[PDB]
């Protein structure tokens, strides 16, 4: 079968502040896909330093079935969160892993309408007292896709993320987030434009909205780039900007 490879890089900025460079490489053959990525997050002014962390990751995806009427796959993943704390009590480092098992599906309802989504089951282990994370988490984004034509499609999804603790007497990091996410994927030749919105339904930890715009360009020579902006707020204003480059090449 054909070996499909991808290599890429991204640089994101989240300021209310954070600089986040990352790279990745993935290979696919038949129903299998293996992805490796490295992500780092720290203050934009780390030069002045402060707490930061890196996030190596290995994911494997398997496609059980891929037909027009029904498609389903599964991804297994592992990540380590390497924290480096600055000017804070306790040890200055911590390592917490995240194990992920997540099915994804796409089911045809009509020639124009589809029901798709994914669901991730997570386990977090080690240094959770320092880290503050709940040891268990479930997340899901599932919904409907109405396709106008090859150029436009509408997607409206329900989103849920929640943290639980298997450890009966520990309530650290527990939370619940529910949202409605709408996207309007536009494909224009080599251009890709996807304006989207996140409508907060409710969230509690221990109304929030976001509007954004994704843009991607494909040079059709294996190279593609992307730019994206997002604005989130409560009453709490946050800004997000990101740029990326991907190079696609196959085998056989
Ligand atoms: C095969 C191509 C790899 C493409 C680069 C992706 C980056 C992969 O991870 C590098 C690991 O970064 C350093 C940390 O020490 C390793 C910890 O174990 C993490 C599991 O991947
Ligand atoms: C930038 C996105 C443009 C895409 C437009 C498609 C809009 C489609 O309809 C979305 C309708 O759903 C709205 C949100 O859910 C209701 C909110 O919850 C109620 C009270 O908080």
Curated annotation (Swiss-Prot):
GO biological process terms, semicolon-separated: carbohydrate transmembrane transport; monoatomic ion transport
MF (Gene Ontology): maltose transporting porin activity; oligosaccharide transporting porin activity; porin activity
Gene Ontology, cellular component aspect: cell outer membrane; pore complex
Keyword annotations: Cell outer membrane, Ion transport, Membrane, Porin, Signal, Transmembrane, Transmembrane beta strand, Transport
Topology in the lipid bilayer: Multi-pass membrane protein
Segments passing through the bilayer: 3-11, 17-25, 32-40, 55-64, 70-78, 95-102, 115-124, 138-148, 152-161, 167-175, 179-188, 196-204, 208-219, 223-233, 237-248
Principal subcellular localization: membrane
Subcellular locations according to the entry: Cell outer membrane
Subunit (UniProt): Monomer.
Its biological purpose: Forms channels functionally larger than those of classical porins.
Record protein name field: Outer membrane porin G
Species, as recorded: Escherichia coli (strain K12)
Lineage: Bacteria, Pseudomonadati, Pseudomonadota, Gammaproteobacteria, Enterobacterales
Name of the coding gene: ompG
């Amino acid at each position: 079968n054909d070996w499909h490879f991808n290599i890429g890089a991204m640089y994101e900025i989240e300021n209310v502040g954070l600089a986040e460079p990352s790279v990745y490489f993935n290979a696919a053959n038949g129903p299998w896909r293996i992805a490796l990525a490295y992500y780092q997050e720290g203050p934009v002014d780390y030069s002045k330093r402060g707490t930061w962390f890196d996030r190596p990751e290995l994911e494997v995806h398997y496609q059980f079935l891929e037909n027009d009427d029904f498609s389903f796959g599964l991804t297994g993943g592992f990540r380590n969160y390497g924290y480096h704390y600055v000017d804070e009590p306790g040890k200055d480092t911590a390592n917490m892993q995240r194990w992920k098992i997540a099915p994804d599906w796409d089911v045809k309802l009509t020639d124009d309408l589809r029901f798709n989504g994914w669901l991730s089951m997570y386990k977090f282990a080690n240094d959770l007292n320092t880290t503050g994370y709940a040891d268990t988490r479930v997340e899901t984004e599932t919904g409907l896709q109405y396709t106008f034509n090859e150029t436009v499609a509408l997607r409206v999804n329900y989103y849920l993320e929640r943290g639980f603790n298997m450890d009966d007497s520990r309530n650290n990091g527990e939370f619940s987030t529910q949202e409605i996410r709408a996207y309007l994927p536009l494909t224009l030749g080599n251009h890709s434009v996807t304006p989207y919105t996140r409508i907060g339904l409710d969230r509690w930890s221990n109304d929030f909205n976001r509007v954004g715009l994704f843009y991607g360009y494909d040079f059709q020579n294996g190279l593609s780039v992307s730019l994206e902006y997002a604005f989130e707020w409560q009453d709490d204003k946050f800004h997000y900007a990101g740029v990326g480059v991907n190079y696609s090449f196959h085998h056989h």
